[PDB]
């Protein structure tokens, strides 16, 4: 298991524009196009991201290219952020994947807002971090995904993702 397999499980794969759990236009492996209500805006963003006239459909190769760029961007965002980088540096390789997962889903700014949870992770107070992380809109809106990420922080293993 690695970060790419992990996020492919959490996000799935869809080759036509769809709406994500918040109602926003998305494509591929959880690539957000726009928070605009306008399907035309979403198609225009898609064409710009892919570099051609897509009419809202992309190939699997194109989805995986956007996915590679998005994983790379999430990692680079962690390492440039003063609140995230020291947490990331303190963690083992499995728990690093959990942090990347959060940043992929809710952005660098959203995750840096989890001040108390980040402190607990940095101190390796895993059971306590897991409780604090669950006191969140994130957990209440996407509880099955949040539970898998939280279990990964708590245990340092991939068990939440095996048999999936």
Catalytic residues: 11, 20
Angle, CA of 25, 21 and 70, to the nearest 5°: 60
**By the rule CB under 5 A, 101 interacts with Cl ion:** no
Q: Considering only 4-12, 111-119, 121-129, 135-143, which stretch makes contact with Cl ion by CB under 5 A?
A: 135-143
The tokens for 118 are 């980040």
We find the least distance from the C-beta atom of residue 7 to Cl ion, in angstroms, to be 14
**By the rule CB under 5 A, 142 interacts with Cl ion:** yes
Q: How far is residue 25's CA from residue 23's CA, in Å, rounded to a whole number?
A: 7
Angle, CA of 51, 56 and 61, to the nearest 5°: 60
Q: Considering only 3-11, 64-72, 130-138, 145-153, which stretch makes contact with Cl ion by CB under 5 A?
A: 145-153
- Grouping H, G, I as helix, E, B as strand and the rest as coil, residue 122 is helix
CB of 20 closer than 8 Å to CB of 27: no
**By the rule CB under 5 A, 40 interacts with Cl ion:** no
We find the least distance from the C-beta atom of residue 45 to Cl ion, in angstroms, to be 25
Q: Among 126, 123, 103, which Cα is nearest to 113's?
A: 103
**By the rule CB under 5 A, 105 interacts with Cl ion:** no
| Cβ distance to Cl ion smaller for residue 50 or 139 | 139
**By the rule CB under 5 A, 144 interacts with Cl ion:** yes
Q: How far is residue 116's CA from residue 74's CA, in Å, rounded to a whole number?
A: 21
**By the rule CB under 5 A, 145 interacts with Cl ion:** yes
Residue numbers of the site for Cl ion (CB under 5 A)? 142, 144-145
């Amino acid at each position: 298991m690695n970060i790419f397999e992990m996020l492919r499980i959490d996000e799935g794969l869809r080759l036509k524009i769809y709406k994500d759990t918040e109602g926003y236009y998305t494509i591929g492996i959880g690539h957000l196009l726009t928070k605009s209500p306008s399907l035309n805006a979403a198609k225009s963003e898609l064409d710009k991201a892919i570099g051609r006239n897509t009419n809202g459909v992309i190939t699997k190769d194109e989805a995986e290219k956007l996915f590679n760029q998005d994983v790379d961007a999430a990692v680079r965002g962690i390492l440039r952020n003063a609140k995230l980088k020291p947490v990331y540096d303190s963690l083992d390789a499995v728990r690093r994947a959990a942090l990347i997962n959060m940043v992929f889903q809710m952005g660098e700014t959203g995750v840096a807002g989890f001040t108390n949870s980040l402190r607990m992770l940095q101190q390796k107070r895993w059971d306590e971090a897991a409780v604090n992380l669950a006191k969140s809109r994130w957990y209440n809106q996407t509880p099955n995904r949040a539970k898998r990420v939280i279990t990964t922080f708590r245990t340092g293993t991939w068990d939440a993702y095996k048999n999936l």
